[PDB]
Design an enzyme around this catalytic site. Structure first.
Site, mmCIF file in Angstrom:
data_model
loop_
_atom_site.group_PDB
_atom_site.id
_atom_site.type_symbol
_atom_site.label_atom_id
_atom_site.label_comp_id
_atom_site.label_asym_id
_atom_site.label_seq_id
_atom_site.Cartn_x
_atom_site.Cartn_y
_atom_site.Cartn_z
ATOM 1 N N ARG A 5 0.825 -1.184 0.000
ATOM 2 C CA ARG A 5 0.000 0.000 0.000
ATOM 3 C C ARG A 5 0.882 1.265 0.000
ATOM 4 O O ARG A 5 0.578 2.225 -0.717
ATOM 5 C CB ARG A 5 -0.982 0.008 1.176
ATOM 6 N N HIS A 11 0.562 4.174 -2.780
ATOM 7 C CA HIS A 11 0.176 5.564 -2.426
ATOM 8 C C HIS A 11 1.290 6.576 -2.732
ATOM 9 O O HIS A 11 0.989 7.745 -2.985
ATOM 10 C CB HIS A 11 -0.209 5.646 -0.947
ATOM 11 N N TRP A 33 -10.470 -8.596 3.071
ATOM 12 C CA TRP A 33 -11.169 -8.955 1.833
ATOM 13 C C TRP A 33 -11.211 -10.470 1.658
ATOM 14 O O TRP A 33 -11.967 -10.965 0.816
ATOM 15 C CB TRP A 33 -10.485 -8.341 0.587
HETATM 16 C C1 HEM Z 1 -10.188 2.547 -6.303
HETATM 17 C C2 HEM Z 1 -8.941 2.454 -5.848
HETATM 18 C C3 HEM Z 1 -8.618 2.093 -4.383
HETATM 19 C C4 HEM Z 1 -9.283 2.425 -3.259
HETATM 20 C C5 HEM Z 1 -10.513 3.341 -3.088
HETATM 21 C C6 HEM Z 1 -8.567 1.864 -2.142
HETATM 22 C C7 HEM Z 1 -8.933 2.003 -0.827
HETATM 23 C C8 HEM Z 1 -8.351 1.348 0.238
HETATM 24 C C9 HEM Z 1 -8.798 1.396 1.618
HETATM 25 C C10 HEM Z 1 -9.945 2.285 2.167
HETATM 26 C C11 HEM Z 1 -7.960 0.631 2.339
HETATM 27 C C12 HEM Z 1 -7.984 0.384 3.864
HETATM 28 C C13 HEM Z 1 -6.996 1.295 4.576
HETATM 29 C C14 HEM Z 1 -6.997 0.913 6.025
HETATM 30 O O1 HEM Z 1 -8.044 1.110 6.678
HETATM 31 O O2 HEM Z 1 -5.991 0.348 6.518
HETATM 32 C C15 HEM Z 1 -7.014 0.013 1.450
HETATM 33 C C16 HEM Z 1 -6.049 -0.890 1.834
HETATM 34 C C17 HEM Z 1 -5.133 -1.482 1.010
HETATM 35 N N1 HEM Z 1 -4.924 -1.151 -0.314
HETATM 36 FE FE1 HEM Z 1 -6.334 -0.182 -1.517
HETATM 37 N N2 HEM Z 1 -7.478 1.151 -2.618
HETATM 38 C C18 HEM Z 1 -7.502 1.242 -3.995
HETATM 39 C C19 HEM Z 1 -6.561 0.705 -4.829
HETATM 40 C C20 HEM Z 1 -5.454 -0.018 -4.440
HETATM 41 C C21 HEM Z 1 -4.331 -0.402 -5.292
HETATM 42 C C22 HEM Z 1 -4.233 -0.014 -6.787
HETATM 43 C C23 HEM Z 1 -3.474 -1.135 -4.546
HETATM 44 C C24 HEM Z 1 -2.096 -1.707 -4.949
HETATM 45 C C25 HEM Z 1 -1.861 -2.171 -6.178
HETATM 46 C C26 HEM Z 1 -3.992 -1.164 -3.192
HETATM 47 C C27 HEM Z 1 -3.419 -1.848 -2.145
HETATM 48 C C28 HEM Z 1 -3.919 -1.934 -0.867
HETATM 49 C C29 HEM Z 1 -3.389 -2.822 0.158
HETATM 50 C C30 HEM Z 1 -2.253 -3.852 0.050
HETATM 51 C C31 HEM Z 1 -4.198 -2.517 1.396
HETATM 52 C C32 HEM Z 1 -4.059 -3.188 2.766
HETATM 53 C C33 HEM Z 1 -3.218 -2.290 3.657
HETATM 54 C C34 HEM Z 1 -3.057 -2.875 5.038
HETATM 55 O O3 HEM Z 1 -3.489 -4.027 5.283
HETATM 56 O O4 HEM Z 1 -2.452 -2.177 5.886
HETATM 57 N N3 HEM Z 1 -5.187 -0.470 -3.162
HETATM 58 N N4 HEM Z 1 -7.294 0.457 0.167
#
Ligand code: HEM
Length: 294
Positions: free
Chosen positions: A48, A52, A191
């Site tokens: 992530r 970002h 998820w």
């Molecule tokens: C429409 C696009 C996206 C949205 C709205 C989105 C939104 C989010 C949200 C709300 C979280 C939870 C944050 C938290 O509460 O810890 C998250 C986690 C995460 N995102 Fe996405 N994301 C998007 C695209 C992506 C992309 C493109 C990737 C990487 C290729 C990604 C990788 C991850 C990963 C690995 C986590 C888990 C982080 C953790 O467990 O600490 N996301 N995302």
């Protein structure tokens, strides 16, 4: 002002072996610091962080992106969209201390590649040469996406990152990893079941789970299954839109195709905004610890 050109400049005298050592230090620390986030480990937060730090890019004027390593500055590190990424940054601090020659952009993006590969994901070719840029080059907050939106929003948002439907659906597969944390984003839950192993589980869960639109404890809507999994409204939009749905079905039915497409889209995301000289080294493919017998 005139869009800047960011030319990749290899860290002086460094070659593949230098970067494999950095990869190894990150991979060994991923293995050692296994307690983080109720034993999920730092793999998902490093993916992530890489996304970002790259995801702020704007194709229209080449602002933001991975090149400058600007997450090290307070405006970006304090972006509400980046809440919780400080854990990924703190993880990488002893790595940067041991390898002070690596640029911040190269370290953040390499952290992402290492995490995916170490979590048994596809190989991600990676190129060095990002150069730290000053504080005034830090992009403003608000370039990262909202989760409470629909497919039209997702499609339009990703056009700014020069990503098409297939690249968007492949990138979203990273949501197999980690979880949402209510205090960070206003969403809660994982998820899927194997959230520190990189698989195509995100697509299988979208298609096969019985989802219910519910409100979480932050008063936000999210899709929940009786298995204990969740989907954000933007994830669920991938099965609401017929064009995204066809691609979700493809990745749910072909693990290798998902791996190959994710690898390409993820390298593209990490390289957006960078000009690689014609005589720059070829992209590096790092061996995992397992492949090295380490
Ligand atoms: C429409 C696009 C996206 C949205 C709205 C989105 C939104 C989010 C949200 C709300 C979280 C939870 C944050 C938290 O509460 O810890 C998250 C986690 C995460 N995102 Fe996405 N994301 C998007 C695209 C992506 C992309 C493109 C990737 C990487 C290729 C990604 C990788 C991850 C990963 C690995 C986590 C888990 C982080 C953790 O467990 O600490 N996301 N995302």
């Amino acid at each position: 002002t005139t869009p800047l050109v960011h030319v990749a400049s290899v860290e002086k005298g460094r070659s593949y072996e230098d970067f494999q050592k950095v990869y190894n230090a990150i991979a060994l620390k991923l293995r050692e610091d296994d307690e983080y986030d109720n034993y999920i480990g730092y793999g998902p937060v490093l993916v992530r962080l890489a996304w970002h730090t790259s995801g702020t890019w704007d194709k229209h004027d080449n602002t933001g992106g991975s090149y400058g390593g600007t997450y090290r500055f307070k405006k970006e590190f304090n972006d509400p969209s980046n809440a919780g990424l400080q854990n990924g940054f703190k993880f990488l601090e002893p790595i940067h201390k041991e390898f002070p020659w690596i640029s911040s952009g190269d370290l953040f993006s390499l952290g992402g590649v290492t995490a995916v590969q170490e979590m048994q994901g596809p190989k991600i070719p990676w190129r060095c040469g990002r150069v730290d840029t000053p504080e005034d080059t830090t992009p403003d907050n608000g370039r990262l996406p909202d989760a409470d939106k629909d497919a039209d929003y997702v499609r339009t948002f990703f056009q700014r990152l020069n990503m098409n439907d297939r690249e968007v659906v492949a990138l979203m597969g990273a949501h197999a990893l980690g979880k949402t944390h209510l205090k960070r984003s206003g969403y809660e839950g994982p998820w899927g079941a194997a959230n520190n192993v990189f698989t195509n589980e995100f697509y299988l869960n979208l298609l096969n789970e019985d989802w219910k639109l519910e409100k979480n404890d932050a008063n936000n809507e999210q899709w929940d299954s009786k298995s204990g999994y969740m989907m954000l409204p933007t994830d669920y939009s991938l099965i609401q839109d017929p064009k995204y749905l066809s691609i979700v079905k493809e990745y749910a039915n072909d693990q290798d195709k998902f791996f190959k497409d994710f690898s390409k889209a993820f390298e593209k995301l990490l390289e957006n905004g960078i000009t690689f000289p014609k005589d720059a080294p070829s992209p590096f493919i790092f061996k995992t610890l397992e492949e090295q017998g380490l």
